[PDB]
Write a protein that binds this ligand. Structure first.
Ligand SMILES: Nc1nc2c(ncn2[C@@H]2O[C@H](COP(=O)(O)OP(=O)(O)CP(=O)(O)O)[C@@H](O)[C@H]2O)c(=O)[nH]1
Ligand SMILES: [Mg+2]
Ligand SMILES: [Mg+2]
Ligand SMILES: [Mg+2]
Ligand SMILES: [Mg+2]
Ligand SMILES: [Mg+2]
Ligand SMILES: [Mg+2]
Ligand SMILES: [Mg+2]
Ligand SMILES: [Mg+2]
Ligand SMILES: [Mg+2]
Ligand SMILES: [Mg+2]
Ligand SMILES: [Mg+2]
Ligand SMILES: [Mg+2]
Ligand SMILES: [Mg+2]
Ligand SMILES: [Mg+2]
Ligand SMILES: [Mg+2]
Ligand SMILES: [Mg+2]
Ligand SMILES: [Mg+2]
Ligand SMILES: [Mg+2]
Ligand SMILES: [Mg+2]
Ligand SMILES: [Mg+2]
Ligand SMILES: [Mg+2]
Ligand SMILES: [Mg+2]
Ligand SMILES: [Mg+2]
Ligand SMILES: [Mg+2]
Ligand SMILES: [Mg+2]
Ligand SMILES: [Mg+2]
Ligand SMILES: [Mg+2]
Ligand SMILES: [Mg+2]
Ligand SMILES: [Mg+2]
Ligand SMILES: [Mg+2]
Ligand SMILES: [Mg+2]
Ligand SMILES: [Mg+2]
Ligand SMILES: [Mg+2]
Ligand SMILES: [Mg+2]
Ligand SMILES: [Mg+2]
Ligand SMILES: [Mg+2]
Ligand SMILES: [Mg+2]
Ligand SMILES: [Mg+2]
Ligand SMILES: [Mg+2]
Ligand SMILES: [Mg+2]
Ligand SMILES: [Mg+2]
Ligand SMILES: [Mg+2]
Ligand SMILES: [Mg+2]
Ligand SMILES: [Mg+2]
Ligand SMILES: [Mg+2]
Ligand SMILES: [Mg+2]
Ligand SMILES: [Mg+2]
Ligand SMILES: [Mg+2]
Ligand SMILES: [Mg+2]
Ligand SMILES: [Mg+2]
Ligand SMILES: [Mg+2]
Ligand SMILES: [Mg+2]
Ligand SMILES: [Mg+2]
Ligand SMILES: [Mg+2]
Ligand SMILES: [Mg+2]
Ligand SMILES: [Mg+2]
Ligand SMILES: [Mg+2]
Ligand SMILES: [Mg+2]
Ligand SMILES: [Mg+2]
Ligand SMILES: [Mg+2]
Ligand SMILES: [Mg+2]
Ligand SMILES: [Mg+2]
Ligand SMILES: [Mg+2]
Ligand SMILES: [Mg+2]
Ligand SMILES: [Mg+2]
Ligand SMILES: [Mg+2]
Ligand SMILES: [Mg+2]
Ligand SMILES: [Mg+2]
Ligand SMILES: [Mg+2]
Ligand SMILES: [Mg+2]
Ligand SMILES: [Mg+2]
Ligand SMILES: [Mg+2]
Ligand SMILES: [Mg+2]
Ligand SMILES: [Mg+2]
Ligand SMILES: [Mg+2]
Ligand SMILES: [Mg+2]
Ligand SMILES: [Mg+2]
Ligand SMILES: [Mg+2]
Ligand SMILES: [Mg+2]
Ligand SMILES: [Mg+2]
Ligand SMILES: [Mg+2]
Ligand SMILES: [Mg+2]
Ligand SMILES: [Mg+2]
Ligand SMILES: [Mg+2]
Ligand SMILES: [Mg+2]
Ligand SMILES: [Mg+2]
Ligand SMILES: [Mg+2]
Ligand SMILES: [Mg+2]
Lengths: 76, 135, 417
RNA sequence: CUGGUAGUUAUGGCGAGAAGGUCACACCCGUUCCCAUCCCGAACACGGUAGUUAAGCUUCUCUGCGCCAAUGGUAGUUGGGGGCUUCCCCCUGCGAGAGUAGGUCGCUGCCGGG
RNA sequence: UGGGGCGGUCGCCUCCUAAAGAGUAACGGAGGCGCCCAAAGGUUCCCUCAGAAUGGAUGGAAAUCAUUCGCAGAGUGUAAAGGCACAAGGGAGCUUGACUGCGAGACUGACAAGUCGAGCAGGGACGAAAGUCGGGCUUAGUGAUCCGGUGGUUCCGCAUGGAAGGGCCAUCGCUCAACGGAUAAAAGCUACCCCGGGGAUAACAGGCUUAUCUCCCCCAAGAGUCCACAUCGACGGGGAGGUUUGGCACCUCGAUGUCGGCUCGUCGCAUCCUGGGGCUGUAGUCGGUCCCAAGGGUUGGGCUGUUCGCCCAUUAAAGCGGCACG
RNA sequence: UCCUAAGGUAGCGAAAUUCCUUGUCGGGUAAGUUCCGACCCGCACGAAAGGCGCAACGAUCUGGGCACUGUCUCAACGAGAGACUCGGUGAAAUUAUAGUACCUGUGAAGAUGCAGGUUACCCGCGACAGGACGGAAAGACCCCGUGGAGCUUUACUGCAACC
RNA sequence: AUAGGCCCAGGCGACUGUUUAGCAAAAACACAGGUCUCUGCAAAACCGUAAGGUGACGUAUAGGGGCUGACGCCUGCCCGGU
RNA sequence: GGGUAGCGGAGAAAUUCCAAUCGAACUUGGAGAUAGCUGGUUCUCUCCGAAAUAGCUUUAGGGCUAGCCUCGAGGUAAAGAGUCAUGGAGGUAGAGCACUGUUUGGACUAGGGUACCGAAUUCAGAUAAACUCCGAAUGCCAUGUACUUAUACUCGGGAGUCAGACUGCGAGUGAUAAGAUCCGUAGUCGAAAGGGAAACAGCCCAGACCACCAGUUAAGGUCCCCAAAUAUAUGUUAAGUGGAAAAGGAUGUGGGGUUGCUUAGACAACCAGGAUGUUGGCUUAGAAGCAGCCACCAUUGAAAGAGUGCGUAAUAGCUCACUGGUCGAGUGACCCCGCGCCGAAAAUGUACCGGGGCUAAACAUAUUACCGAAACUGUGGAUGAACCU
């Protein structure tokens, strides 16, 4: 006559935050994730909780590394 | 009656039955089979009744195949209980059959008793069927 | 296979251990397995909890350490006992009546039996509506001077509902009883003797009937059920027997009985024992290889008296006499038979026993059938035991024995020596 | 011809068979020192070439596994319109998965020797 | 809160629902948290798992040994998801960056809060060096303000010098768990009850639905002395009705009187009697079942508030339902 | 033999107390869910919240019988007071305006007033109560309001009083 | 004209009496009787801030409070908890 | 005639009485107590025009910030909208067994004591919201020099709203019920009149500034009520189907395909024949084709069965298969499709086309005219904004 469920967390707003070809300011976030779905490429670093940010001003370019992986790069 | 030995989750969605059958739309094991023309849920009780009436006429001569199995389970509520306060407890097991799916097979008997045995089976199922043969 | 306990108290019974073992067998019949047998020797059943204040704790502990779900009691419990036990043991409870109703509800393979089981179950569950509805009656909306809310009380409404849905099945069963005698019309119009069998479960009644049918019936393919499970046969079957001397009677089998059968179900079997109610010869198949056979036999007589079978010629037939070592079968003493219903000597023995009992007015009388008039030679061959026949120039000479009806039906053809 | 060192979605891999070599590269010998093993100079480390292509390595052949891959058709579906509405049908645009014709025993850059 | 009460829940993390960006509800389907680690953190160097077969053993199916095969079928302190074998998994040497002041720019977001961050200065650990280090593979392991305690201080100190006291930085005291916390401090009965509201919300009646209920059928195993279909018909399947038990909460709370009986009836037919007919396990009498048929008719008492029911005595028969359960 | 401070004694017992329940047997009746007498299986009797009896008393509650009767089968007649016609005097509750039919349907899901049909010349008098969800009383039942009041206690905080 | 109907059996309360003016006349209250307990006199109890009073112009065979309710037969076990 | 007065008095005790008022009298004052609750709020025209959501709350019919409306003022690397080209992140529909659960039928039993397995290998075939070796259509983010089009943003003044409803599509709970409940997405109502659905907020067409005895169209229609086709061409239905409802049953009817036989005579009828060993054996009182089981022959002949159904207790007798003749034009067997039939029962009165009525005035395909709105156009007026002179 009762239910033991009814609990859920708070959504973490994951996913991409900048688009391909868009000029981006240094220090800005590009992709929020758990683990490493996308690897940091050129001028991109991965933070403590695996958020890829940009080190220098440039243009975001999502691009394909070896057969089963992806990376994001920033080009001046 | 055909029930799963164990299940990962006791509760499942009702689902849907739109489109053609994904696979099993042809006869492969025997030489005659019942083919569904419409789509409906088939409980395990209707599978049993349509099988006893199907082997009894054959006098236990020849092999039959059951091409469906009741994987999904369904729940129900008692009379006198208002809506809410969770989900109902499971009652039975069903097999959603989309149109174009073979449900039975016959081999090892002549033409005359194969069609008649399938005819008695079809009257115990809630779908419109058709007797189909191999090639 | 569900895991259950088995509990019972002596309460001045004369058959405590046998009834306990019978409850064990009944539980094993319902795809239910036992994991403990608690027996108490208290004189009077406790008014509140069937067993007692202290025994409840022992039952609870044994079921807790034995991994059991349901507890099967040995006698029907009043609603207060049901509530107290189900609330203290924090599990479910079930008595003999509920168990045997569940057994019958699963073995019924006809409309009449199903309707009878349903009416008996509904009557059983009629007294427990108070405890069924007390939980919702503590919170039945409450209030006071509604000035617009109905005119009755919740409990009384529930009683009205259940009585309304019970008299309908009562009427349906009355109609079914009236129907059942249309098929009996042809047997009634033609006075034909019938031999009906009663006894206790697994006494061999069906095996006896099958042996006789295979021995004499023309339609030998027509057989009867035969299995070791409790209550294999739940419906009566009539068969027509033709002894080699051209004699005709019918032989019927009935459902078996068990000890302390609920009184609700005997009311339902009042109909199913109509065939034995109006019979000519009874056979009471008593097992002779089970030491409580005296108890089972007597129980059969009390059940029969409850149904209303009396003033009936009874022939006792002890079965399974092969198992007993160094015994003389087939035999006959008074009106008692020792035999096993799996041999070609016991069966034929019982056949001439029935021949002695039923047909005893078949006096012999010579006949002189006119030679031209046929159709009487044939009639006096399939309805008599022709001793000798002779041929003359003025007709044909027949000597045989016929029923006293035929002595006046064909009185003119007889000729005195 | 070979030894290093990079790029390139395994069409670059796996497996199978053959040829070759002190000019390289390896296998190999020994443990004095630098260093080394939860014990073991097996590896690591050091000192050399008595012996060797049987291994690693290079070249050659394959479709056996793997990998890559059309065309046509089909499921699905945005927009519009119909029905007998567990669902189903018609017009236009997009268009798989599986299966298949087919390809594959790699392609480029730099440096040192023979 | 599919009326209220009893029951259950109240904050945080993970998955599905969630309709291929993000977000998205229900007393919808599954689980965890209120910690732990002085190495389970940093750095340098090194290597690789589960399982199986084979021969020998005290020692057995499974303890330790050798070989072979072995893309993860293991492991990752703990739940799940995402991820990792150019380790984020496993060993050993040295250590305390589980540092101080900060911080361009972004994510999330009503606010309060929460998250990521290149880079600069001070002074260090590891490493030959390039370099890495502001706790742990990532995401939970926590509660504001007011008020008090402890340590420090180049701040103020009610005429002046002090002091009492306060300020600033660091830190401690909450199952304030109803977890954005009303107060430092809190349980029940009302049928003796009263006021302001509501058909936003229950009890009677209407409405939608038809699980349940009543009735009618399909297949035919069987019963019926042989005999599926005179009469019944299991295991299964399909409908009609809106009289039952239910679900919803659409009209009525500035009042829609609520059981049974009395008087008065009227309508439907799924017919209790009477009328006509087909089949019969219809010889006759008595019956059974089905088709047409609503013209008329359809009892008096004992017990109970009783509807119903049981019983006594009759009758051609003692019908079933609708009309706000007329 | 275990625990407890101790384990319900006498007397009653389907009771003003028994859910099951119309318990079971006997009486009364043609037929008795009530009544009377027994049984004890006391859900949940029990000794000053007194237990079991008890003559007299009761506008007390319950079951039965004699006499009596219009209570009834089943109604009939008669008398007086209203009603009814005439002369005098003459209110009230209610009221959006009204030339204010029936049926089937529709609609905030129950229509004199909407749609389609069927009926119906204009105005009154004596009667009956099916509808106007008829009149009267801002529902008491139910829920709500961080409304109220009376009462209780081992709820919080207090005061009188007493030691 | 005016002027008791009676009888058999049971529950409750012993009896006469009192009660919800205006819905309940009772099986409810009271009652004579039983028992426990407090009180030595400026008594205990009660009204009043006090003075002053009732108790009482009484004295324990007297006065206040709690429970039971004629009369008959009886009134069992437990002092751990309050 | 007197005594006891409301934080009080009386009470043979019922919340009983204290001036028709008592779970706490009446009167005046604090007092215009407080009411997150219900009711009420008065002249006109012009321009714009919502919400019924998120978060927190002793909070749920209240409030605060944000979201949505209106008025005023600013600044330009013109930033808003639509389409096109190009680049991306994301695992739904579908599908699949490469992992994990569920599961069918075979070969398969190293070892336990041969599934009873601890079981495993392999072949073939299924299944999944919490499975994925794969994977769209749409949607979303951005760049452009593209074409078109009018908004965006910031600051400030003023609000209202936080009960939503139905319909189409995708899901959950429910029973793959509800005019049910809870979300996402689009529309309409709310706040929308007009025309069609008989009547009928949410369905279909379509947005009313005013006047006109002007015209063209949309949904829907053109026999009468009621404006416009008793229109054209080719077919179907006989059920008032059209204008209500299934499993299942059937020589209803129309259209295609596959085929046997036949003027060296097809089917149907009429005439004749239809027999012998022989009553085959066994079982039976009785079994002669026809109670039951066993092989079911040869003979006359072109045909006749060791007999297809009646019948006798049983013989008898009746009849058929087959053959010959008689007359002379077609007949027998399956599959596919369209429209129809039965299954079909309720309460005041036909009552399941609005009515009349219809054999087309019904249905299918195609074609042409007309009617039809406050829509659009024509004529004449009134008015708001922006931009010009
Ligand atoms: N030893 C023995 N066994 C017998 C004898 N008769 C029957 N049995 C066995 O006992 C079993 C019981 O079956 P049976 O008695 O025929 O069934 P039943 O008694 O008719 C069941 P019900 O009585 O409920 O209809 C049978 O399987 C049979 O093998 C006998 O005389 N001796
Ligand atoms: Mg989450
Ligand atoms: Mg880290
Ligand atoms: Mg961290
Ligand atoms: Mg690759
Ligand atoms: Mg109440
Ligand atoms: Mg039997
Ligand atoms: Mg050389
Ligand atoms: Mg040395
Ligand atoms: Mg393609
Ligand atoms: Mg492809
Ligand atoms: Mg999406
Ligand atoms: Mg998302
Ligand atoms: Mg939990
Ligand atoms: Mg404070
Ligand atoms: Mg100073
Ligand atoms: Mg100073
Ligand atoms: Mg809160
Ligand atoms: Mg009120
Ligand atoms: Mg409502
Ligand atoms: Mg209702
Ligand atoms: Mg109503
Ligand atoms: Mg009103
Ligand atoms: Mg009829
Ligand atoms: Mg008749
Ligand atoms: Mg008849
Ligand atoms: Mg009639
Ligand atoms: Mg009487
Ligand atoms: Mg009703
Ligand atoms: Mg009524
Ligand atoms: Mg009684
Ligand atoms: Mg009584
Ligand atoms: Mg009595
Ligand atoms: Mg005492
Ligand atoms: Mg008492
Ligand atoms: Mg006492
Ligand atoms: Mg007494
Ligand atoms: Mg007395
Ligand atoms: Mg008068
Ligand atoms: Mg007058
Ligand atoms: Mg309606
Ligand atoms: Mg109406
Ligand atoms: Mg009208
Ligand atoms: Mg009048
Ligand atoms: Mg009106
Ligand atoms: Mg009214
Ligand atoms: Mg009100
Ligand atoms: Mg109060
Ligand atoms: Mg009395
Ligand atoms: Mg008295
Ligand atoms: Mg008196
Ligand atoms: Mg009164
Ligand atoms: Mg009175
Ligand atoms: Mg004095
Ligand atoms: Mg008393
Ligand atoms: Mg007393
Ligand atoms: Mg004490
Ligand atoms: Mg003491
Ligand atoms: Mg007083
Ligand atoms: Mg009062
Ligand atoms: Mg009271
Ligand atoms: Mg008084
Ligand atoms: Mg008064
Ligand atoms: Mg004031
Ligand atoms: Mg207030
Ligand atoms: Mg506008
Ligand atoms: Mg509101
Ligand atoms: Mg605002
Ligand atoms: Mg694109
Ligand atoms: Mg799918
Ligand atoms: Mg503003
Ligand atoms: Mg909100
Ligand atoms: Mg809301
Ligand atoms: Mg909504
Ligand atoms: Mg709906
Ligand atoms: Mg709704
Ligand atoms: Mg709602
Ligand atoms: Mg609009
Ligand atoms: Mg509004
Ligand atoms: Mg409109
Ligand atoms: Mg309109
Ligand atoms: Mg309509
Ligand atoms: Mg209109
Ligand atoms: Mg306009
Ligand atoms: Mg026109
Ligand atoms: Mg016209
Ligand atoms: Mg009618
Ligand atoms: Mg216009
Ligand atoms: Mg103009």
């Amino acid at each position: 006559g009762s239910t033991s469920n009814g609990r859920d967390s708070e959504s973490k707003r994951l996913g991409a935050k900048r688009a391909d070809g868009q000029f981006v300011t240094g220090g800005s976030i590009l992709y929020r994730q758990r683990g490493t779905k996308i690897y940091p490429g050129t001028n991109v670093g991965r933070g403590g909780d695996d958020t890829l940010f940009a080190k220098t001003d440039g243009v975001v370019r999502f691009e394909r590394m070896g057969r089963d992986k992806k990376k994001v790069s920033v080009y001046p | 009656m055909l029930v799963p030995k164990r299940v990962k989750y006791r509760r499942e969605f009702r689902g849907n039955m739109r489109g053609r059958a994904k696979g099993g739309t042809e006869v492969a094991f025997g030489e005659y089979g019942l083919q569904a023309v419409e789509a409906s849920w088939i409980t395990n009780r209707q599978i049993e009744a349509a099988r006893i009436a199907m082997t009894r006429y054959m006098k236990r001569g020849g092999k039959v195949w059951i091409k469906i199995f009741p994987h999904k389970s369904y729940t129900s509520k008692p009379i006198g209980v208002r809506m809410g306060k969770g989900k109902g407890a499971p009652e039975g097991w069903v097999s959603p059959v989309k149109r174009g799916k073979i449900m039975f097979e016959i081999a090892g008997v002549p033409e005359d008793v194969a069609r008649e045995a399938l005819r008695l089976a079809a009257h115990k199922l809630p779908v419109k069927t058709k007797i189909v043969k191999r090639e | 296979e569900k895991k259950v306990l088995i509990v019972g108290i002596s309460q001045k019974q004369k058959d405590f251990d046998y009834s306990m073992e019978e409850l064990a067998n009944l539980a094993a019949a319902n795809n239910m397995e036992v994991v403990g047998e608690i027996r108490q020797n208290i004189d009077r059943e406790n008014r509140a909890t069937y067993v007692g204040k202290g025994k409840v704790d022992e039952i609870k502990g044994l079921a807790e350490m034995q991994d059991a779900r349901l507890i099967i009691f040995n006698d029907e419990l009043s609603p207060s006992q049901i509530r107290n036990l189900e609330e203290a043991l924090e599990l479910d409870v079930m008595d003999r009546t509920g168990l045997i109703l569940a057994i019958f509800a699963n073995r019924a393979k006809t409309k009449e039996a199903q309707l009878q089981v349903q009416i008996a179950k509904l009557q059983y569950e009629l007294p427990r509506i108070f405890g069924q509805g007390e939980d919702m009656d503590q919170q039945s909306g409450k209030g006071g001077l509604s000035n617009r809310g109905s005119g009755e009380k919740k409990i009384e409404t529930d009683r009205r509902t259940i009585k309304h849905q019970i008299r309908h099945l009562q009427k349906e069963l009355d109609m079914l009883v009236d129907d059942r005698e249309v098929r009996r019309r042809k047997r009634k119009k033609n006075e034909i003797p019938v031999v009906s069998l009663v006894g206790y479960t697994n006494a061999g009644k069906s095996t006896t009937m099958n042996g006789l049918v295979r021995a004499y019936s023309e339609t030998a393919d027509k057989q009867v059920f035969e299995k070791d499970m409790l209550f294999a046969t739940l419906e009566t079957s009539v068969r027509e027997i033709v002894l080699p001397d051209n004699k005709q009677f019918l032989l019927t089998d009935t459902v078996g009985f068990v000890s302390k059968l609920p009184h609700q179900l005997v009311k339902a079997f009042r109909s199913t024992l109509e065939e034995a109610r109006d019979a000519d010869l009874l056979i009471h198949v008593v097992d002779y290889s089970d030491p409580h056979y005296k108890t089972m036999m007597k129980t059969t007589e009390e059940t029969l008296k409850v149904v209303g079978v009396e003033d009936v010629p009874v022939i006792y037939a002890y079965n399974k006499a092969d198992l007993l070592e160094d015994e003389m079968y087939p035999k006959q003493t008074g009106n008692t038979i020792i035999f096993s219903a799996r041999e070609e000597e016991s069966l034929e023995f019982l056949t001439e026993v029935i021949r002695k009992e039923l047909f005893a007015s078949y006096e012999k009388a010579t006949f002189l059938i006119p030679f031209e008039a046929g159709q009487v030679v044939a009639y006096l061959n399939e309805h008599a035991d022709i001793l000798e026949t002779e041929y003359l120039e003025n007709g044909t000479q027949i000597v045989a024995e016929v029923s006293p009806a035929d002595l006046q039906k064909l009185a003119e053809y007889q000729v005195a020596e």
